[PDB]
């Protein structure tokens, strides 16, 4: 392990346009708004 | 080191314009329901 620490050593690891999945929820809420608007419009 | 705003112009202009067109269509539809009230 000491020699691998000497040689094989890296770094351990784990935007304004990150809402690519929020816009799907925007589309679902728009579809729900259109459906409820049709429900309120037919009566 | 110490190398330094994403508010509107460095912020994305695609989905913001989508929200603007969406509230435009919502305003048109709500005024259309306001005019045609059964």
From Swiss-Prot, chain A:
Tissues where this protein is expressed: Detected in brain cortex, olfactory bulb, hippocampus including the dentate gyrus, striatum, thalamus, superior colliculus, inferior colliculus, midbrain and cerebellum (at protein level). Detected in brain cortex, hypothalamus and cerebellum.
Record field: transmembrane: 21-41
Cellular localization per UniProt: Cell projection, Dendritic spine; Cell membrane; Synapse; Postsynaptic cell membrane
Organism domain of life: Eukaryota
Record text on subunit structure and interactions: Heterotetramer. Forms heterotetrameric channels composed of two GluN1/zeta subunits (GRIN1), and two identical GluN2/epsilon subunits (GRIN2A, GRIN2B, GRIN2C or GRIN2D) or GluN3 subunits (GRIN3A or GRIN3B) (in vitro). Can also form heterotetrameric channels that contain at least two GluN1 subunits and at least two different GluN2 subunits (or a combination of one GluN2 and one GluN3 subunits) (in vitro). In vivo, the subunit composition may depend on the expression levels of the different subunits. Found in a complex with GRIN1, GRIN3A and PPP2CB. Found in a complex with GRIN1 and GRIN3B.
Domain comment quoted from the record: Contains an N-terminal domain, a ligand-binding domain and a transmembrane domain. Agonist binding to the extracellular ligand-binding domains triggers channel gating.
Reported function: Component of N-methyl-D-aspartate (NMDA) receptors (NMDARs) that function as heterotetrameric, ligand-gated cation channels with high calcium permeability and voltage-dependent block by Mg(2+). NMDARs participate in synaptic plasticity for learning and memory formation by contributing to the slow phase of excitatory postsynaptic current, long-term synaptic potentiation, and learning.
Record-stated family: Belongs to the glutamate-gated ion channel (TC 1.A.10.1) family. NR2A/GRIN2A subfamily.
Protein's name according to its UniProt entry: Glutamate receptor ionotropic, NMDA 2A
UniProtKB/Swiss-Prot annotation, chain B:
Residue spans crossing the bilayer: 13-33
UniProt tissue specificity: Detected throughout the brain, in brain cortex, cerebellum, thalamus and olfactory bulb.
Coiled coil: none
Compartments where found: Cell membrane; Postsynaptic cell membrane; Synaptic cell membrane; Postsynaptic density membrane
Subunit architecture: Heterotetramer; the NMDAR subunits are modular and harbor tiered domains that function in concert to regulate opening and closing of the cation-selective ion channel pore. Forms heterotetrameric channels composed of two GluN1/zeta subunits (GRIN1), and two identical GluN2/epsilon subunits (GRIN2A, GRIN2B, GRIN2C or GRIN2D) or GluN3 subunits (GRIN3A or GRIN3B) (in vitro). Can also form heterotetrameric channels that contain at least two GluN1 subunits and at least two different GluN2 subunits (or a combination of one GluN2 and one GluN3 subunits) (in vitro).
Function: Component of N-methyl-D-aspartate (NMDA) receptors (NMDARs) that function as heterotetrameric, ligand-gated cation channels with high calcium permeability and voltage-dependent block by Mg(2+). NMDARs participate in synaptic plasticity for learning and memory formation by contributing to the long-term potentiation (LTP). Channel activation requires binding of the neurotransmitter L-glutamate to the GluN2 subunit, glycine or D-serine binding to the GluN1 subunit, plus membrane depolarization to eliminate channel inhibition by Mg(2+).
Protein name in UniProt: Glutamate receptor ionotropic, NMDA 1
Native source species: Rattus norvegicus (Rat)
């Amino acid at each position: 392990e000491e020699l691998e620490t000497l040689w094989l050593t890296g770094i351990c690891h784990n935007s304004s346009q990150l809402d690519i999945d929020n816009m799907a929820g925007v589309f679902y809420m728009l579809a729900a708004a259109m459906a409820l608007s049709l429900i309120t419009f037919i009566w | 080191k110490e190398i330094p705003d994403s508010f509107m112009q460095p912020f994305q202009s695609t989905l913001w314009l989508l929200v603007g067109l969406s509230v435009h269509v919502v305003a048109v539809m709500l005024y259309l329901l306001d005019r045609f009230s059964p």
